[PDB]
Amino acid sequence: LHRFITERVVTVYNLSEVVTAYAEWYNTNINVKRHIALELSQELENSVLEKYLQWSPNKTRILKGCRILHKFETLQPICEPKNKWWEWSPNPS
Amino acid sequence: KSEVLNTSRLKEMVNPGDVTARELNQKQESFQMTATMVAASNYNFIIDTTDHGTWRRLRHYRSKVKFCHNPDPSNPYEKKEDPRFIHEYIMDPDCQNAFFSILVYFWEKLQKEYNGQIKKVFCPTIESETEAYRKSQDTLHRFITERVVVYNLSEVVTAYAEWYNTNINVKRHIALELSQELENSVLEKYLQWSPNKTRILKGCRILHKFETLICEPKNKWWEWSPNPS
Ligand SMILES: Nc1ncnc2c1ncn2[C@@H]1O[C@H](COP(=O)(O)OP(=O)(O)NP(=O)(O)O)[C@@H](O)[C@H]1O
């Protein structure tokens, strides 16, 4: 999740397209797996998105600062003992 | 992760019903089942039902604490975790005896106060957070409030299916039940009865991207508090 965050993102873009984008990114970058969008919302609130956190008129806590990407668009904004280590060394060891 | 309950294997369990299960090849005596049930998780419980039969034998609550070894102050919902409640404090006989005493005392209190009826006892935090969860987990209302403010009915069910998969998760639905719940939902001011013998709605908008329109004890809460408690 954080790899996708600080790999593809640097309007509010809603959130369904966001979850689908993360799903396809994970399928391509990592493995083909289905993600339940509610979970992705919870970890998105848990991830670094509070600065982008916003609200929608349809009663939807929404995001901001969104950078869309679907192709090659790129960025588009200690020590050692003498001879006895088993001697346990001093208290710091 | 979060899983759905599918409303099977639940009402039967919630109700104390005797059952001649087990002994598939043979036959195990019908045994009466009577056990208090508790379900907790770090994730969400997906529910898929609307019948009064369901949503009536259920109770919901949400915790408001968290224990950690770095107890940052200024947050009342955070305390220094004790890495000792688990590795010990369980095998000690005396603590178990004390807990058993607490349980028997509470059962005696319940029996002498509410005559054994757990439904009659009143908790405002409960039966309010529960109906708050009821306001959720009912995705049809969310779809209606998100996408619609005659288009027939196949379009409606397909729109609900695509919305659900996108908003929640790719899941399969049946058009008939969705329609009947639509006449069971807040659509009757729009829903009508066409002369072509096809129940349809009216004033239907299909949005695509953005189309606009109590008390505290002295020091002993186990004193049962006053009668309202
Ligand atoms: N009232 C309390 N005072 C102090 N420590 C507590 C208290 N209640 C719980 N703890 C500690 O906080 C932790 C409770 O977390 P807990 O819910 O058991 O974790 P979990 O996610 O369920 N799985 P696990 O971390 O293995 O226990 C344990 O380490 C307890 O010892």
Automatic annotation (TrEMBL), chain B:
ADP 10 binds at residues 82, 85. ADP 7 binds at residues 67, 82, 85. ADP 2 binds at residue 82. ADP 6 binds at residues 56, 67, 82, 86. ADP 5 binds at residues 42, 56, 67, 82, 86. ADP 9 binds at residues 56, 82. This is Putative primase C962R. It comes from African swine fever virus. Belongs to the asfivirus helicase C962R family. It comes from the Viruses. ADP 3 binds at residues 42, 57, 67, 82. The lineage of its organism: Viruses, Varidnaviria, Bamfordvirae, Nucleocytoviricota, Pokkesviricetes. ADP 4 binds at residues 42, 67, 81-82, 86.
